[PDB]
Amino acid sequence: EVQLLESGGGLIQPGGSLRLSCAASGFTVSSNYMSWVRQAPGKGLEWVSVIYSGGSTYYADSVKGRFTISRDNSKNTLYLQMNSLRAEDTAVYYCARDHVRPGMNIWGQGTMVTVSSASTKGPSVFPLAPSSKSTSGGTAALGCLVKDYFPEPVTVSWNSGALTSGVHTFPAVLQSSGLYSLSSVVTVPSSSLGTQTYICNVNHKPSNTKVDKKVEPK
Amino acid sequence: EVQLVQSGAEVKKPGSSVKVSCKASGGTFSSSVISWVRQAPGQGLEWMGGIIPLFGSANYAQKFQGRVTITADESTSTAYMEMTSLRSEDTAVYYCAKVSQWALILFWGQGTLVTVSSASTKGPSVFPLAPSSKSTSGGTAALGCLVKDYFPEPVTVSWNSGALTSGVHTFPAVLQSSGLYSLSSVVTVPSSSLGTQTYICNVNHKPSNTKVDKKVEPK
Amino acid sequence: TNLCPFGEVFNATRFASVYAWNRKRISNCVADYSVLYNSASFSTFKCYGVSPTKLNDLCFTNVYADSFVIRGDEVRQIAPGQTGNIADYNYKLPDDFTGCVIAWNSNNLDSKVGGNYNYLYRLFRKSNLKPFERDISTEIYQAGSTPCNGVKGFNCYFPLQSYGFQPTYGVGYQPYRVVVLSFELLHAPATVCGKK
């Protein structure tokens, strides 16, 4: 199986530095054309940098002189050194093995880079409690409000991954405070309220915040 | 672009000399190989010699080493071929041909005709080639006109004022040892028509303003 | 006492692919470079270390004439200090290059209606060429750990790419013939000179 697994993204103060890594399996990074592409949240794709099979490097003008693409054969890993970082460099960064011949193109799943002077802050997790008096068509809703965190991302699971059907974890919105907030909800049969326990597992790695919140009726 | 323009036709008497020019336009003259090529009538192309105007050291084919001098003038982009002690055998078209050091193509001039003859302009005598009463080749008879001792080329020959074009062969002229040209025009016809059909050959020689209509009758 | 045979480089019927670029050495001859720098036939005529209008005033120990076909958009890589598919993997000029790069459009000669697949360039290479290096390998390119054993496949790619020149392509995708003239002024005597 060919894999591109990225790491290194996080929150960095403006003007600071960050190194992204792209650990590859299934092909030899130092022998191949490889690139970085970024996507600001809610926006389109922007090419950042390419390294050719033989080492020549090219850069988007918005990052020339600040970013450096490189690779290490012993670790079969592609890198992106990002210096003098700017607010507008905030985005998800993808590595890719570029299309050259058919059957080659593949992208990693991305790492989030946030450039901000703001502090890292973990979330408060509040229950959205169900009620047998608030059911609609034999269906009850419950959830978790994950409030006032920075930066992205958080992950939310229900009952440790056993409850997936009916879950809606909403995209985060930036509040007026500069903090993010989201809800994760699930609809369930109303007959399951007295008998089934519902626990939301919230993880916010930038703050090592791990919360399991039991959500019970009223 | 490049263009080679040679001097005009020449008529020269045996023993005289001739100097043919070749003016080149285009700026490739000095750094070129400029050669002279001859073609005698009925014969092939023959390289005579050549020169590079940058070095001025002409080189000649063995057959021409004695009587040919090839010169080149960078100030006027003109090359020259001078041949001395002319004889009738030197009658030919002389061509200049050029190769630039910057390409593999060849540039040629238009040709210069040199005719070696003691002759002045002279119109032809026209003599009949009478059909035989016994030399019938299988029911066909041959008749013609001998167009002899004219200078220079060309003559035109028609039969019956152009009404007779079928079966006519007008042969290329030869330069005789007298310095004058000669040719025959012949036509094959049914033998059965020899006593009914009139055959006249019309010879025109524009250089001498000479027109001759010769009636060819059985012997 | 000899004219330099530049015509058999510039005027040849067929040119080399850039991965297999031709080289002719020019020595002990004279040339009127006026026919060159006064030609309108040339879309590129950039000289480095020498002035084009002055080549008739200099002598050189040795002249090399390299020649090949690339597409129009790639002629800019035939210069010192350049990177890219052609400069990195096909034909590389040194940073201290002294000489002239000459190029002209050859759509009428090197394009064909179905595509001319005879002109190729190297697309895959593990390292860049040194200046004036020529790489004619057609070994399958190993893009992973597993060896290729002469078989194309995943991570196993033919290293050359055909231009497929077609007469209807745009100018930057049309064939251009290139001649690189390398003038060497060493300690040897002056052999290749210019004249009027």
Place this chain on the structure above:
Amino acid sequence: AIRMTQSPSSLSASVGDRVTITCQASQDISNYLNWYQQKPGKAPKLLIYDASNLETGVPSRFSGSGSGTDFTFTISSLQPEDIATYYCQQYDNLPVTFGGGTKVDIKRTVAAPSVFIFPPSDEQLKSGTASVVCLLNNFYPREAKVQWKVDNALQSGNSQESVTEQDSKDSTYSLSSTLTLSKADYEKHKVYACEVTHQGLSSPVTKSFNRGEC
């Protein structure tokens, strides 16, 4: 840089429909144009390379056409798993450049939302703040209107909405509207309601609670 002008920016089509996207380049790029598919949450995946070539594995209902400046990308029969944002990309002129993207909505029968309102938790109120959440669950089309009514007054300026991307399984959307108040302001009002207008509802649906009642 080469500008890629992609249109439309969004489209909505029924299952089985033919969907055509266009891309126009600012200059001649021959056929060095690739088409990417980006599904919600995922990295882009190459579908079509060099304008017309189907990448290995990619179903045959995807196609492409073009040379020079004008290009198209077609889906023969749209499927609900084709919910994605589609991007063109020219790759032979640096910098590599992408079109703006085409967002694809799959059509289904109108689906009215289930509506739920959540009061703030006692735990949040001890902190000095009160979030009220209104949930619209599993609806189509995406167009919906949510109004907060506080003691029958229309409340603006203190609510934020978030919508899910269209579900690949049932082709629905869900939406949350969160109303955030200081604990002091929250205690100035009694009845908190969200009123929901949507094409699947013959009349607006209102869900409410009285602050301090259970």
Place this chain on the structure above:
Amino acid sequence: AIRMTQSPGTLSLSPGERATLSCRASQSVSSSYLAWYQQKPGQAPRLLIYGASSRATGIPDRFSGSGSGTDFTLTISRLEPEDFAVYYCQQYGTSPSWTFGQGTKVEIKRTVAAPSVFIFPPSDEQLKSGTASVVCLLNNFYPREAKVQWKVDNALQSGNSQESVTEQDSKDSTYSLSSTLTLSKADYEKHKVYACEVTHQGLSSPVTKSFNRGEC
């Protein structure tokens, strides 16, 4: 010096056929400096190929040159009627030292046609001027190779006859030929029998046509 020998000397083909002309050099020659010419009667040579394989302007692509070293080839993929002509090869260079091949004639192939032979005595009007020209006509033959020998009282003449040949006829692909025997009137009136003997591939036995001077 270098010698370029062309082969064959005469190529006899029909329109639509492929023509392959050869040029062989006594030494190895650079392929960059090999040319081919076409010449038609009464015309200057026309450059077709230069640099062994480059076509000059206006030359159709049914003409292709190839070769290297000592063997070079001009191929005409399908003869058109305009293609029947004489073709020369040329070795050249950036030095003044060039040589031409001797020529290959590409002619229309045809069935063998024996000549019709005619002999013409000198006219009484020409004899008034002291000369006697005797004319022997070979009419409409193929192939071009023919022998014409003059016998005067069974004595083989030499050095007093000239031949002319027509170009190959556009409609029947034959040649015609005139041999002219020129004697002084004094010599002509010394002898009795004037004969031209003709040898040709279409004649079973050599055909002799004669007349006795003074007979009708």
